[PDB]
Amino acid sequence: VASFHGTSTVANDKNESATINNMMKHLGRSEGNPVFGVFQKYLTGHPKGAAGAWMLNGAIQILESGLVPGNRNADNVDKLLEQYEYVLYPSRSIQTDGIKAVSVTSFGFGQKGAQAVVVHPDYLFAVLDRSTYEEYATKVSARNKKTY
C-alpha cells in the first residue's frame, strides 16, 4: 500500500501521486503491479499536526489484518491521475491474503515532507532461531493476559 497524505487539495493530491509513480518507476516496479492508495483523511479529516500518526496506525493495522481500507468518498477519481500507472485508488475495502510492507508519505508546509515504510512483523521473526521465538511467544502470551 501507500498510505497517502491525501489532503483533498488541488496540488497535494497530484503531487503525491506524481512522486509515488516516479519513485516506483525509478526503482523498477514490475509493470502492472501498482500500490494501493488509502486516504484516511476522507474519514478522519486532516489532523493538521498529527496526520502521520493516524496514517501510521492505519499502516500497522493493515499489516496486521491484511485488509485495505478504501476512500468511501471516492466520487470520481480525477482524470489526470490515470497517467500514473503504478498506483491504484481503491474505494472499497478489500481484504487481501497478506501485505508485506506499507508506505507512509506525508507532506508539510515549507517543504518538509517525509516518508516511512513499515514492513510486516513476520519478516522480523524469521531472523532469529526457534528457541528464542518460542520463548518470546510465551512471554507475549503472559503479557497479553495481564494487559487484558
Partner: protein, 175 residues
Amino acid sequence: IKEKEASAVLQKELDLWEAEHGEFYAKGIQPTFSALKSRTYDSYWNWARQDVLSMYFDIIFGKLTSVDRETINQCIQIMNRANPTLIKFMQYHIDHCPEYKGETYKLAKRLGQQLIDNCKQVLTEDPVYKDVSRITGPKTKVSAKGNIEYEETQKDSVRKFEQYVYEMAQGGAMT
C-alpha cells in the same frame, strides 16, 4: 401600516393559489434542480483495476466459485473496460499468483488466464451489455402459521436470457 396591508394583499393573493391547488401540490412544485449539484462519474479506468483485484481475492477466499453466475457477470463487466494497462495489471497478478499456497489459487490463476485471453480479444471492440444473471420468477407462499411471504426464486426451466426469449416466443394466444 402600508407594508402591513400590502402584505395582506399579497397574502390574499397567495392563499388563492393554495386553496385552488392544495398543499401537497404546492410543496411538490418546489424547483430543486441546480447545475452546481451535478455529479459526473467517469473514472472507469480505475474501477477496472479495482474490480479485477476484488475478484482476484474473492476467488481465492472461495467467496466466488467459478460455477457461479455472478463471477461471469463481473468478468463480462471487466472486459467491458479492458485497457492495454488492464491486461498488464491482470497479467502480472496471474504470473505471481502462488499456486503452492493452496488449491483456490489454481482456480484463481486459471480463471485469470482465461479472462486475460478474453480481454486480449475484446480489446478495441465496442463495449457490450450481456446480462447473464439467473432468471427468477415469483413464488408466494403462506406460512403454516399463516404468514404471507413473497419469494422471488429462480426458475428451473428458464435460467438464461437465451432461454427467456424462447419462452417469450411461445406466448399466450396459444398459451
